[PDB]
């Protein structure tokens, strides 16, 4: 039956966009985390 | 000498495994983006 399927496909898409938003946010954490390290790390070289 | 060496060995063994684990986990997360994008909407919604 048509309406059921067509709406269901649309419903799936609403999940998907949230999943990829998580992955983006996760990636923002990776950049933040590496910045945090690299910034300090380069100073540690100076300290020693 | 055995201790000082062992301590350095331990220290880096741990740290390398941790940052490897982190980059491995991040790498599979990036691959999971490509896989979930490969979960394309070009699907049986068309059939509905």
Coordinates of N, CA and C in Angstrom, one line a residue:
Chain A
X1 N 0.8 -1.2 0.0 CA 0.0 0.0 0.0 C 0.9 1.2 0.0
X2 N 0.5 2.3 -0.8 CA 1.4 3.3 -1.1 C 1.8 4.3 0.0
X3 N 0.8 4.8 0.7 CA 1.0 5.9 1.6 C 1.9 5.5 2.8
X4 N 1.7 4.3 3.2 CA 2.5 3.6 4.3 C 4.0 3.6 3.9
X5 N 4.3 3.2 2.7 CA 5.7 3.0 2.2 C 6.3 4.4 2.1
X6 N 5.6 5.3 1.4 CA 6.2 6.6 1.0 C 6.5 7.4 2.3
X7 N 5.6 7.4 3.2 CA 5.9 8.0 4.5 C 7.0 7.3 5.3
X8 N 7.0 6.0 5.3 CA 8.1 5.2 5.9 C 9.5 5.6 5.4
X9 N 9.6 5.7 4.1 CA 10.9 6.1 3.5 C 11.3 7.4 4.0
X10 N 10.4 8.4 4.1 CA 10.7 9.7 4.6 C 11.0 9.6 6.1
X11 N 10.4 8.8 6.9 CA 10.7 8.6 8.3 C 12.1 8.1 8.5
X12 N 12.6 7.2 7.7 CA 13.9 6.7 7.7 C 14.9 7.8 7.5
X13 N 14.7 8.7 6.6 CA 15.5 9.8 6.3 C 15.7 10.7 7.5
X14 N 14.7 10.9 8.4 CA 14.8 11.7 9.6 C 15.8 11.1 10.6
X15 N 15.8 9.7 10.6 CA 16.8 9.1 11.5 C 18.2 9.4 11.0
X16 N 18.4 9.2 9.7 CA 19.7 9.2 9.0 C 20.4 10.5 9.2
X17 N 19.7 11.7 9.0 CA 20.3 13.0 9.2 C 20.8 13.2 10.6
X18 N 20.1 12.6 11.6 CA 20.6 12.7 13.0 C 21.8 11.9 13.2
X19 N 21.9 10.7 12.6 CA 23.0 9.8 12.8 C 24.3 10.5 12.2
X20 N 24.2 11.1 11.0 CA 25.3 11.8 10.4 C 25.7 13.1 11.2
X21 N 24.7 13.8 11.8 CA 25.0 14.8 12.8 C 25.8 14.4 14.0
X22 N 25.5 13.2 14.5 CA 26.3 12.6 15.6 C 27.8 12.5 15.0
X23 N 27.9 11.9 13.9 CA 29.3 11.6 13.3 C 30.0 12.9 13.1
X24 N 29.3 14.0 12.7 CA 30.0 15.3 12.6 C 30.4 15.8 13.9
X25 N 29.6 15.7 14.9 CA 29.9 16.2 16.3 C 31.1 15.4 16.8
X26 N 31.1 14.1 16.6 CA 32.2 13.2 16.9 C 33.5 13.7 16.3
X27 N 33.4 14.0 15.0 CA 34.6 14.5 14.3 C 35.1 15.8 14.9
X28 N 34.1 16.7 15.3 CA 34.5 17.9 16.0 C 35.2 17.6 17.3
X29 N 34.8 16.5 18.0 CA 35.6 16.1 19.1 C 37.0 15.7 18.7
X30 N 37.2 15.0 17.7 CA 38.5 14.5 17.3 C 39.4 15.7 17.0
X31 N 38.9 16.7 16.3 CA 39.7 17.9 16.0 C 40.0 18.6 17.3
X32 N 39.0 18.8 18.2 CA 39.2 19.5 19.5 C 40.3 18.8 20.3
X33 N 40.2 17.4 20.3 CA 41.0 16.6 21.1 C 42.5 16.7 20.6
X34 N 42.6 16.6 19.3 CA 44.0 16.7 18.8 C 44.6 18.1 18.9
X35 N 43.8 19.1 18.8 CA 44.2 20.5 19.0 C 44.8 20.6 20.4
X36 N 44.0 20.2 21.4 CA 44.3 20.2 22.8 C 45.7 19.6 23.1
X37 N 45.9 18.4 22.5 CA 47.1 17.7 22.6 C 48.2 18.5 21.9
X38 N 48.1 18.9 20.7 CA 49.2 19.3 19.9 C 49.7 20.7 20.4
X39 N 48.8 21.5 20.8 CA 49.1 22.8 21.4 C 49.9 22.6 22.6
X40 N 49.5 21.7 23.6 CA 50.3 21.6 24.8 C 51.6 20.9 24.4
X41 N 51.6 19.9 23.6 CA 52.7 19.1 23.3 C 53.9 19.9 22.7
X42 N 53.6 20.8 21.8 CA 54.6 21.7 21.3 C 55.2 22.6 22.3
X43 N 54.4 23.0 23.3 CA 55.0 23.7 24.5 C 55.9 22.8 25.3
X44 N 55.6 21.5 25.4 CA 56.3 20.6 26.3 C 57.7 20.4 25.7
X45 N 57.8 20.4 24.4 CA 59.1 20.4 23.7 C 60.0 21.6 24.2
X46 N 59.4 22.8 24.2 CA 60.0 24.0 24.7 C 60.5 23.8 26.1
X47 N 59.6 23.4 27.0 CA 59.9 23.2 28.4 C 61.1 22.4 28.7
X48 N 61.2 21.3 28.0 CA 62.4 20.4 28.2 C 63.6 21.0 27.5
Chain B
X1 N 69.0 0.7 36.3 CA 69.0 0.8 34.9 C 67.8 -0.1 34.3
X2 N 67.6 -1.3 34.8 CA 66.5 -2.1 34.4 C 65.2 -1.4 34.6
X3 N 65.1 -0.8 35.8 CA 63.8 -0.1 36.1 C 63.6 1.1 35.2
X4 N 64.6 2.0 35.1 CA 64.5 3.2 34.3 C 64.1 2.9 32.9
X5 N 64.7 1.9 32.3 CA 64.4 1.4 31.0 C 63.0 0.8 31.0
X6 N 62.6 0.0 31.9 CA 61.3 -0.7 32.0 C 60.2 0.4 32.1
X7 N 60.4 1.4 32.9 CA 59.5 2.5 33.0 C 59.3 3.2 31.7
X8 N 60.3 3.6 31.0 CA 60.2 4.2 29.7 C 59.4 3.2 28.8
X9 N 59.7 1.9 28.8 CA 59.1 0.9 27.9 C 57.6 0.8 28.2
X10 N 57.3 0.7 29.5 CA 55.9 0.6 29.9 C 55.2 1.9 29.5
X11 N 55.8 3.1 29.7 CA 55.2 4.3 29.5 C 54.8 4.5 28.0
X12 N 55.7 4.2 27.2 CA 55.4 4.4 25.8 C 54.6 3.2 25.2
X13 N 54.7 2.0 25.7 CA 53.9 0.9 25.3 C 52.4 1.3 25.5
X14 N 52.1 1.7 26.7 CA 50.7 2.2 27.1 C 50.3 3.3 26.2
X15 N 51.2 4.3 26.0 CA 50.7 5.5 25.4 C 50.5 5.3 23.9
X16 N 51.4 4.5 23.2 CA 51.2 4.1 21.9 C 50.0 3.3 21.7
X17 N 49.7 2.3 22.5 CA 48.5 1.5 22.3 C 47.3 2.4 22.5
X18 N 47.3 3.3 23.5 CA 46.1 4.2 23.6 C 45.9 5.1 22.4
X19 N 46.9 5.7 21.9 CA 46.7 6.6 20.8 C 46.4 5.9 19.5
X20 N 47.0 4.7 19.3 CA 46.6 3.7 18.3 C 45.2 3.4 18.4
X21 N 44.7 3.0 19.6 CA 43.3 2.6 19.8 C 42.4 3.8 19.4
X22 N 42.8 5.0 19.8 CA 42.0 6.2 19.5 C 42.0 6.4 18.0
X23 N 43.1 6.4 17.3 CA 43.1 6.6 15.9 C 42.5 5.4 15.1
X24 N 42.6 4.2 15.6 CA 41.9 3.1 15.0 C 40.3 3.3 15.1
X25 N 39.9 3.6 16.3 CA 38.5 3.9 16.6 C 37.9 5.0 15.7
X26 N 38.7 6.1 15.7 CA 38.4 7.3 14.8 C 38.4 6.9 13.3
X27 N 39.3 6.0 12.9 CA 39.4 5.6 11.5 C 38.1 4.8 11.2
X28 N 37.8 3.8 12.0 CA 36.5 3.0 11.8 C 35.3 3.8 11.8
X29 N 35.3 4.9 12.7 CA 34.2 5.8 12.7 C 34.1 6.5 11.4
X30 N 35.2 7.0 10.8 CA 35.2 7.6 9.5 C 34.7 6.6 8.4
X31 N 35.2 5.4 8.4 CA 34.7 4.4 7.5 C 33.2 4.1 7.7
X32 N 32.7 4.1 8.9 CA 31.3 3.9 9.2 C 30.5 5.1 8.6
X33 N 31.0 6.3 8.5 CA 30.4 7.4 7.7 C 30.2 6.9 6.3
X34 N 31.2 6.4 5.7 CA 31.2 6.0 4.3 C 30.2 4.8 4.0
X35 N 30.2 3.9 5.0 CA 29.3 2.8 5.0 C 27.8 3.2 5.2
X36 N 27.5 4.1 6.1 CA 26.2 4.6 6.3 C 25.7 5.5 5.2
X37 N 26.6 6.3 4.5 CA 26.3 6.9 3.3 C 26.0 5.9 2.2
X38 N 26.8 4.8 2.1 CA 26.5 3.7 1.3 C 25.2 3.0 1.6
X39 N 24.6 3.2 2.8 CA 23.2 3.0 3.2 C 22.4 4.1 2.5
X40 N 22.5 4.2 1.2 CA 21.8 5.2 0.3 C 20.3 5.1 0.4
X41 N 19.6 6.2 0.2 CA 18.1 6.3 0.0 C 17.6 5.9 -1.4
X42 N 18.4 5.4 -2.2 CA 18.1 4.9 -3.6 C 17.4 3.6 -3.6
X43 N 16.4 3.4 -2.8 CA 15.9 2.1 -2.3 C 14.5 1.7 -2.7
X44 N 14.0 0.7 -2.1 CA 12.6 0.2 -2.2 C 11.5 1.2 -1.9
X45 N 11.8 2.3 -1.3 CA 10.9 3.5 -1.2 C 10.4 3.9 -2.7
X46 N 11.3 3.7 -3.6 CA 11.0 3.9 -5.1 C 9.9 2.9 -5.4
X47 N 10.1 1.6 -5.0 CA 9.2 0.5 -5.3 C 7.8 0.7 -4.6
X48 N 7.8 1.5 -3.5 CA 6.5 1.8 -2.8 C 5.8 2.9 -3.6

